[PDB]
Amino acid sequence: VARYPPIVASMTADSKAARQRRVQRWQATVHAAPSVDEKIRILTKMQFKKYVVHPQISALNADRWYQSFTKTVFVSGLPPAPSLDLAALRAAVCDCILQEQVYVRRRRPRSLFDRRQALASSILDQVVRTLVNLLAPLNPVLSTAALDCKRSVDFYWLRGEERIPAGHRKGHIDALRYQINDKPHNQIRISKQLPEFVPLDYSIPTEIPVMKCKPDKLPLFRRQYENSIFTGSKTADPCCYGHTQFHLIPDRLKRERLIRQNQAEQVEAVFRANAIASLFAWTGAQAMYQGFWSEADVTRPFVSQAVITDGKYFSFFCYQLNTLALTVQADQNNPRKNLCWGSQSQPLYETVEDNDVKGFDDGTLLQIVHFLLNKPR
Template sequence: MKGLRGILRADPGQSLHFSTSSVLRSRKVKRRPKYVYPNVGAFRANNWVVNRRQHPDLYEGQMQRKQWDYPLGDDQRASWKHWRWYDQFYRRWVDMTPKPPMKDFDVNYKEKRGMIHDQDTIQMKFALLLDKDHKKKYIVPPLNMEFPRNLSYFYQYLTKTKFAHGLPHGVESTPIEASELEEFEQFLTCILQMELKHNTKTADEKNRKQRADRIIEGIVRYLMASHAHHPDFEDCTLDMNPENHMYWQRGRGFHKYDKPPLPFGFQSRDVPLYQIRTKNRLAAFSPWMEEFALSGDIPECDHLPYVYGVDRKLYRNMISPGFRHKGGDILLNYDVAWKERQLANLPPPIYDPHPFGHTQFISMPEKFCKQWYEANLEHCDITDQIEEHVKGHGIMSGWTWSAAQAHYQGHWMDNDVQNPYCVQTVVSDGSHFAFFCYQLNTVAIDPDNATTNERRNLCYGTPFMKLYDIMEGSDDIILHQDTTKLFLKFIKNSSVNVSNKEDCLQHDNGLELQKWNSDNPHLELQTPKHAIEMEAAREIARQAEIEKNKKLIHKVIDWVKK
């Protein structure tokens, strides 16, 4: 072994041949570097890198280059800011990702986040906003069937959202022609008959999910084909199974070994079945900066999220509205271009021309089934939570998509939006549909900004409405027009569909809001609208049963007397 190492030091390029026994005895030699430098000075001379501490002036000069060009000439000047540039003198790549010292930057404190304002591109802002926070965070799924009770109230708190029962004035007032509605219902009848009569494999969850996906796919294809003349759809993008991600901070609490308490991080991930994106953003559902968007109770949550079964784990911080901000700008392209001496011809990244969302169609996961909510060995009857889970899904999906779009436009917690971002969401399990309109008025909901920020995000929503009924005996399909009309109203909404301000405010003030009972500030003690309606229906049925029994008793008494 000693002689072998001496040979490697003497001539690192010499090809050596060993017997099998020598290789077995010298297996550790393979893990040693190919070349052993005689001293530390020789190693530093051959692997010299600009260091922040030892070469502060040179390091700052490299990192603060305002002209993103290569030093070979003006013909190689870059027209867009690169992730890194090649220093010809030191023969090293210089990474332009900001690397602030820990003492100068901390994403958890507003007074130490000022460096994010100084960054030129979205990628550099995200490098500070997302990549510098490595603590555990809570993973928030859009559909959480294991949540104890009243999921929508908890999601209202996480996203600072005010929920209104109903749809905005701009959607409700959209005119629908009778012939257009008739054609759409004929198409729906055809695809439903095909699915219900011919595709009868519904024994397991996977087949139910596939059937729902096919029904939603048929509806989306028809709507897009029949409204190709729509001003926003002449140039748009239809995504299939995109991934929407959103990371944000909300509330404060104690983390292990942390003093004082730090903000809690939350990460959501949503995968719609279809997603429509356009060049222009939708018109505001409610007037910007009016009383309806600046007032209203937001639920409060004093408990840590893990009390409600929300997982806290290590997860990469991600923000994405279903597409990449600069497609193709990856480090591999720089290496290939340098090897081929084509840095001057390095193509710029691809910017998506449709950054604003219009409508997303979401299919419930395989595990969602109404029979699961009925009483069984696992739990009691919780059918009243179906509406809560669907409502929570609409709130979280709307927040994830709209907030990610706002961040891609350069907004973040300390640089709030100046115009609302509006999106539409359709949630379905194939037979029932719920329609939601989400208006993002603020992303500054972290604990440093929430106390002084009066804006509320708005979410309009409908119940989980049935699409069709099947007549007994004839198997004929009867469609519910209240549901079919909403598909056409959603797809007809556009960026130019601006409603009168007074009419919008009057309509919004007439909507019923989801109320927060501050006297009993616990999520499980809140009573949503559908629970009140279900209790009222049970009371009516109970009184009817009592009256029926009284009449029966009187009949029996009269019969006995006779």
């Protein structure tokens, strides 16, 4: 009947073990917060220097770097696995391309450099809106979904640690902070989660890339400002899940420029980096809207898909989020990893001659339709 005190470190001492106990004290406040807003507020109120991750970035091999920052496995292809008058959709989509390119009269941009970019934006907005309208009868969820134009999606997370190399804080250990601030051209948000693409705890032999250098060597720079976790709408919004995201590659990153710059192999890499960064930010933000964070990992895989286009070519990506436990404390013993599926870019049409689009490919249109026909179970 001896009540020995528990063998734990001091709360107030100046030691590593004592600090870790103070970390758990703060984290317990998050576990004890009833509202999802308090959990996010507590998790993000303290601002420090963080790497700013750009989904669209000209850095070489950014896709492999982005996998390490996210713990994402990239699998080439599509995730393992209703008559809709394909001709009717083809006619409407062809009309969308012709309308903006050949028929509408507007005050042209003053810049003389945005004219090509503005044209690409116009058609993609038209294509997305009409397809989400034409395909609504087959998939009723799209009727109640929310269509967003250039809305902000934000995710903030910790992964890894570093020893501060200089200054009065030399030798202190600090976690590596990352934030993705993204503004997808278009995205669709629904009030019901999509079905998973693979079972949680799914395992494959492929290995996430390991980067020898720090994030800086891939040109990446730090700033300190508001930490934000955003899905495109506030937590009060009923439509708290994601269906599909549409991204337009900037003209700076388009195929012809890259070949001239001699970075031919980066044509596909540009698409993949945008998908991995954008979809991890979206799904991770959705998961945190449900109360899941690094110390309370997701119980349900979180899924979203994106189509990434340079205005003519299209690529399709599927993402499944299995882990928000990316921190050193939470990732010490984690068999889970996040999954991304992607396909090579394929043209949707070749050129507009006379008033008829030439080279239109049905196959690419089906992939857009199949993505839009995905429904919650």
